[PDB]
Every structure is written in C-alpha cells, then in structure tokens.
UniProtKB/Swiss-Prot annotation, chain B:
Pfam families hit by this protein: RNase_T (PF00929)
Protein name: Ribonuclease T
EC number: 3.1.13.-
Taxonomic source organism: Escherichia coli (strain K12)
Record: active site: 174 (proton donor/acceptor)
Organism superkingdom: Bacteria
Annotated site location: Important for substrate binding and specificity: 22, 66, 70, 117, 139
Family per similarity comment: Belongs to the RNase T family.
Gene name tied to this protein: rnt
Miscellaneous section: Member of the DEDD group of RNAses that are characterized by the presence of four acidic residues in the active site. These residues are conserved even when the proteins have highly divergent sequences.
Subunit annotation: Homodimer.
Single GO molecular function: 3'-5' exonuclease activity
Exonuclease domain sequence ranges: 13-187
GO biological process: cellular response to UV; DNA damage response; DNA replication proofreading; regulatory ncRNA 3'-end processing; rRNA 3'-end processing; tRNA 3'-end processing
Length: 208, 207
C-alpha cells in the first residue's frame, strides 16, 4: 500500500554520520548522508532522494586523534568542500518535510546502523544550529543492526550486506554517503523480503 | 538450530527498566527485570530464566517528581523490598554469564523496547556499582520497537503486542517485570514467525 500505512505514519529516512569522536555533545560532526525512501504502487520500498555533506566542525568542537586516524578525515583540508552543520541539516530537513507531506506521513524516523549513535549526533547538531521544527522523532529509530540480526543473523553492516547478496567495498566504509546507500539498500531489502515471503501485509499469510 | 548460531553468537537477554527520570547519568534506577531466552531442538525461541528487582536509588541520585507521578513508584516505601544496584545487576550478570557459556555464545545483547533507554540506564548502574566483566555488549542492542515496526507495522509496545495477538494489560504497563515478559514474548513471536514463514534459516526459502 502506501508508505504512510507501513510504519504507522513514520517517514523512514536513512542517515549516516562520520565524526571526530564518540561523544555527540563534545565531538565534531564531519560527514552526514541522507536517503529518503518511497513505495511504488505495489507497496515495494526503495531509495528516493539522496543528500550528502562534508561538515565543518562547530566552534568549540573537540577532535579525537584516534577518530580522525580511523575514518581518515582531515577537517583542516581546504578542498573538503565542507559546509556548516546548519546548512547540511537545513537542506536535509527541507527534503524530509517535503517527503513527509507528499507521502501523507506524520513525521520522520531515522534509519541507521546502530542508530542511536547517528541519532545522537544529528540531533545534537540540529540543536547547535538552532534548527526549528525538527521533523525527526526525538528518540525513536529503526536500527538496522537489530533488523539485520533478525532478517540475516548478522549485526555488522558489511557482513549483513554480504549475507544479503549485496556488494560491500571496505575501501569506502569510512564514507557517510557510501554507508548510507548500502544501509538504505539493506533496509529496503529486509522490508521487501518480508513482504515477498508473505509477512506483510498481515492478512497475506492467510489469503492463500 | 542453536541459539549461538542465530545472532552470530549474541546472547539475547530481554530487559526492562523503571526510572526516576530520563537521564541515565543522574536519575535513579528503580526497577529492572531480565529474561534470558533459549532455543529448543528445532530452533524455536522461548523465555528461559526470569529475574526482577525493585532497586534502591543510588546515593546522590535525582528523582523527578514527574517520573514518580507517572510510574507510581514511591522509593521511600519500606515495603517495596528494594535491593542495591549491585545486588540486582550482579545477580543478572551471574545468570546471563551462565546462559552465555551453556549456549556456546560469546556475548550478551540487550533486547528492549526503545532499547537505548534501558541500555543506558543498565550500563550506568553497572558502572556506579563497579561491576566487573559486564557480559552485555557496550553499544549493540535489539530494539523491539524497530523489529515490531518491521514485523507488525507497529512501534508502540502495547499496540505491537495486540497486533501480534497478545494480551496487554495497561494496568501493569508501569511494571518492569510485566513489560519485560510481554516484550520477551513479542521478540520470540517475531523471531519465530520469521522462521515459520521461511525467512530463517537463509537456506529454507530454496528448499
Ligand atoms: Co575530501
Ligand atoms: Mg555509521
Ligand atoms: Mg520500558
């Protein structure tokens, strides 16, 4: 049916984040990717709009060396094409509000791998940027680590995609955009496979 | 069909908490329940061991009157048979570790509704109590809100249970033990139906 019927009004948005640490309050946000979803007329789920940004560290932001050493990001590189947290989120929020309205959903829910990590950073940044009318649910998320745990028996993203028959280039694992895309395809695959096997809608199982 | 094979070695333990606020760092833990799971020979999932505790507020803990008014808990009632965070968690960890070894798993993962909330409160209590060798994964969880969203198109615990054909008594919604048992049955129902519809194991579909 309609996307608005699938998750009780929740407009699922796949989000990934790269950072300069583990602490959403103190550490900088360096990258964020966003992929909205849409359902065709037969009720199949698929990626809709894709956004991605290199993000400037907020003034007073801490930068953990090990974080940089891990994700390989150097915030001081002038060729980053980085934008402010406000600019990135404002563009993502705009697209999301559009989708919510167009789809007849009541609000957005973040889809992410170990979602709380990405949720905490995005929400913190939005707060720093004084963003109004944050379309996202304040604490609800769709953790694909848990979903993949159920659907595929794997909780690590790369193994989940592999087990799902998807490609995964560890070469791009530190890229917010790449992770977001793989996670969007993964999530869509998990949901669609549920419908395919007659798990959805709930009346399908008996109508045979 | 082994539990240790179902979630790449993760030992799913259902957990629910009742609190005196929204902040895990500052607010008191008041209730905690724990339900380990087990798989039969055919690989069906079901509740195993059940634990439940009323918890003493750690000394120096804040207590939001809004929270107390909501959950109906009176931490000052001497008849609530409370125990320290150490007592409670130490007992759960003991039971959990035994389950992990007996099932051949390697680590425990918390199963909770909006799991981050309970995870953060349990982990914070564990730190306050200086518990050693916490068997739970430090950030991974199985949020039943998201799983029910997938399996049942519902994210609210009560509505998710109803949609799944389970009973839900609002009268008991403020009890950690009750929420934990309902959530455990929900999680099992979700895992079991995925298997029964041919979703698991992965090879089943082509058989
Ligand atoms: Co660059
Ligand atoms: Mg990530
Ligand atoms: Mg709860």
């Amino acid at each position: 049916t309609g996307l608005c019927d699938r998750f009780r009004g929740f407009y699922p948005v796949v989000i990934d984040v790269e950072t300069a640490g583990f602490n959403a309050k103190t550490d900088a946000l360096l990258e964020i990717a966003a992929i909205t979803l849409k359902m065709d007329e037969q009720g199949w789920l698929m990626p809709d709009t894709t956004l991605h940004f290199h993000v400037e560290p907020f003034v007073g932001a801490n930068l953990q060396p090990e974080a940089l050493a891990f994700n390989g990001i150097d915030p001081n590189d002038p060729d980053r094409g980085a934008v402010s947290e406000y600019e990135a989120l404002h563009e993502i929020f705009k697209v999301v509000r559009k989708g919510i309205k167009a789809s007849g959903c009541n609000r957005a829910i973040m889809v992410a791998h170990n979602a709380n990590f990405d949720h905490s950073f995005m929400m913190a940044a939005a707060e720093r940027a004084s963003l109004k009318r944050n379309p996202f649910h304040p604490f609800a998320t769709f953790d694909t680590a848990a979903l993949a745990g159920l659907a595929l028996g794997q909780t690590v993203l790369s193994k989940a995609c592999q087990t799902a028959g998807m490609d995964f280039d560890s070469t791009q694992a530190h890229s917010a955009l790449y992770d977001t895309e793989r996670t969007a395809v993964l999530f869509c695959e998990i949901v669609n496979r549920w419908k395919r096997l007659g798990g959805w809608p709930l009346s399908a199982a008996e109508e045979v």
